[PDB]
């Protein structure tokens, strides 16, 4: 039921947990906002997360951890997100994989969450979450040939965008596609 990813991204020290949550919440508010409210693009949020991830400043790491932990723990609610926000979420989730902001257990989990989304009905919101996330990290697929085999085995793989079919099939062979 409730997932708990605190072993990857520890909970903040109690002393400033309120402020860390509020800061994380603010970044998400901005990634989902529309003008005239303040916004941040997915690329801007990714740039910040890259700086924070292994920052020597505890507060920055704590906000990174809070954002990633909450994002991943939100997966079971993604189907409840409006289409606009779900798409932004997909781009962010795929970008996190693309930029190597998750490794080991969390990378495997991220890949699994994308794969499970792609298995949802063709044309569904979660299918499109999967496609958008996958397009962000497609240049990494050749490093995960068994993952590519699993993608190719999806019952509606033949309906994926052409370029993604190429990246996946060549990725099964640990290769780039013929053009990127």
């Amino acid at each position: 039921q409730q997932t708990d990813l605190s072993q990857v991204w520890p909970e903040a020290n109690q002393h400033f947990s309120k402020e860390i949550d509020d800061e994380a919440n603010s970044y998400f508010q901005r990634i989902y906002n529309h003008p005239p409210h303040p916004t941040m693009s997915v690329d801007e949020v990714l740039e910040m997360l890259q700086r924070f991830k292994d920052s020597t400043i505890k507060r920055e790491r704590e906000v990174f951890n809070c954002m990633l932990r909450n994002l991943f723990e939100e997966y079971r609610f993604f189907p409840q997100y409006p289409d606009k926000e779900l798409h932004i979420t997909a781009c962010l989730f795929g970008g996190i994989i693309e930029k190597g902001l998750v490794t080991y257990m969390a990378l495997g989990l991220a890949l699994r969450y994308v794969l499970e989304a792609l298995r949802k009905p063709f044309g569904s919101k979660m299918y499109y979450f999967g496609i958008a996330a996958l397009d962000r990290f497609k240049n990494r697929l050749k490093d995960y040939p068994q993952y590519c085999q699993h993608l190719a085995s999806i019952s509606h793989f033949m309906q994926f965008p052409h370029h993604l079919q190429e990246y996946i099939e060549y990725g099964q062979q640990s290769r780039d596609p013929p053009v990127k």
Binding site: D21, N25, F28, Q29, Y32, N70, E74, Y81, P82, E85
Partner: peptide, 12 residues
């Protein structure tokens, strides 16, 4: 443990 922003956008 959800952040308010996610409670807000979620249609439950």
């Amino acid at each position: 443990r959800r952040l308010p922003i996610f409670n807000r956008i979620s249609v439950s």
